[PDB]
Amino acid sequence: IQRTPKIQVYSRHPAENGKSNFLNCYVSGFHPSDIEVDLLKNGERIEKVEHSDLSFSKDWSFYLLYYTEFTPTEKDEYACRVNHVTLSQPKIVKWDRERTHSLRYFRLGVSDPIHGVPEFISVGYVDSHPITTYDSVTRQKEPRAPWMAENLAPDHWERYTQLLRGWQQMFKVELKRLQRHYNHSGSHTYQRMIGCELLEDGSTTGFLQYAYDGQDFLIFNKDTLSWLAVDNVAHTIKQAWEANQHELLYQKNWLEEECIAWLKRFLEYGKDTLQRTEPPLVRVNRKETFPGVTALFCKAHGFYPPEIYMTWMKNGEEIVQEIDYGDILPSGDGTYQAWASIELDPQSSNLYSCHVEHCGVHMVLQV
């Protein structure tokens, strides 16, 4: 099942003409992984374009960010051009107008990529921060964060590069078995996700899952040490794996113990960035796009962690049941932005208000 990319074009900071800024093209929710993204200045490709490394979501969808340094010109027209399997022709999008932590590791396999993209990639994350990276082209596990490279001995990288070289071969072999079993030809994707969550109160959560072509394939239940299979093909794989009772017990123990221990270790190594809280800056704007149309936009920016809650209240008593919302977007500098717009009443004002909650801070912008 293919999924088409969600393309969102926006600036890192609120845009004002003549002031340098960063243009973002957040490309998310797409499957398979192969994509081509360009940023266009007045219809022309931009030579210097930065982009985060390929990232992975828990729904098996892929996400990325493309950014470039620019200064907004009232005349300049910036847009983002995306190529994907689901797009018979490129799609151009104009630029209009904490306490819970998680460690998780993903494995990605692509058969017949026919690209300068690796056959196998594996990335680790603490709270949406890539801590480590490994791929088949590199054949080496390298820290993706600086706080990870200043606390782990070089032997640690050697030891786990050996595990990842073996896991890579297993993924290549396991992927062929699935294509033969399904009689599939061409490029297909194999995905794995393992991780644990450490809640504020001390509770722990764990998960291990496999996906074939972006669809749930095998789900490990660590409470019953069973692999749940979606298909009869997955059932065949389930039977092979469930033979090795030792492997299953290791999964339970790695999730409940080693994973949380690793996570606590990392949350200290990166305490400066991971335990950081940046409060949001909220401004209310009034816009009249058409005659007799007025809307209020509660816009928040520069906060971390991305967990935020925004709402509008008519007369300061009850919530509005017609509130449009904006996605929480990565601005590119480690902070996040969002917005919430309501249609201003043509009648006499109800004295609307905006309410923002972020990490225990409550802001009310009564206008």
Ligand X SMILES: *CC1=CN(c2ncnc3nc[nH]c23)[C@H]2C[C@@H]1C(C=O)=CO2
**65: CB partners within 8 A, 6+ apart:** 24, 25, 26, 27, 51, 52, 330, 332
Q: How far is the CB of 360 from ligand X (least distance, A)?
A: 31
Nearer to ligand X, 39 or 218 (CB): 218
Residue 141 labeled ligand binder = yes
Residue 362 labeled ligand binder = no
Q: How far is the CB of 106 from ligand X (least distance, A)?
A: 7
For residue 348, the 8-state DSSP code is: S
Q: How far is the CB of 319 from ligand X (least distance, A)?
A: 43
**Where are any strands of DSSP class E within 294-335?**
295-303, 309-314, 318-319, 324-325, 329-330
Residues 306 and 128: their CA atoms lie apart, in Å, by: 10
Residue 192 labeled ligand binder = yes
Phi and psi torsions of 188, nearest 5°? -135, 160
| Burial of 359: CB neighbours in 10 Å, binned 0-12, 13-18, 19+ | middle
Residue 304 labeled ligand binder = no
The residue with tokens 């590791």 is 105
Tokens of 252: 């339970």
Q: How far is the CB of 152 from ligand X (least distance, A)?
A: 7
Q: How far is the CB of 232 from ligand X (least distance, A)?
A: 26
**40: CB partners within 8 A, 6+ apart:** 46, 78, 79, 80, 81, 92
Number of residues written out for the chain: 367
Q: How far is the CB of 367 from ligand X (least distance, A)?
A: 49
Residue 265 labeled ligand binder = no
Q: How far is the CB of 137 from ligand X (least distance, A)?
A: 17
Q: Which residues bind ligand X (CB under 6 A)?
A: 105, 107, 122, 124, 132, 160, 194, 262
Collapsed DSSP state (helix, strand, coil) of residue 173: helix
**249: CB partners within 8 A, 6+ apart:** 225
Q: How far is the CB of 105 from ligand X (least distance, A)?
A: 4
* Distance from chain centroid for Cα 149: 23
Nearer to ligand X, 262 or 297 (CB): 262
Residue nearest to ligand X (CB): 105
Nearer to ligand X, 266 or 303 (CB): 266
Residue 122 labeled ligand binder = yes
Nearer to ligand X, 22 or 262 (CB): 262
Report the chain's C-alpha Rg in angstroms.
Answer: 23
Residues 327 and 42: their CA atoms lie apart, in Å, by: 26
Residue 251 labeled ligand binder = yes
Nearer to ligand X, 124 or 330 (CB): 124
Residue among 268, 164, 255, 179 at smallest CA distance from 217: 179
Sheet holding 353-358, edge to edge: 318-319, 309-314, 353-358, 361-366
Q: Which residues are annotated as a binding site for pyridoxal?
A: 141
Instruction: Mark the binding-site residues, compressed into ranges.
Output: 107, 122, 141, 156, 192, 250-251
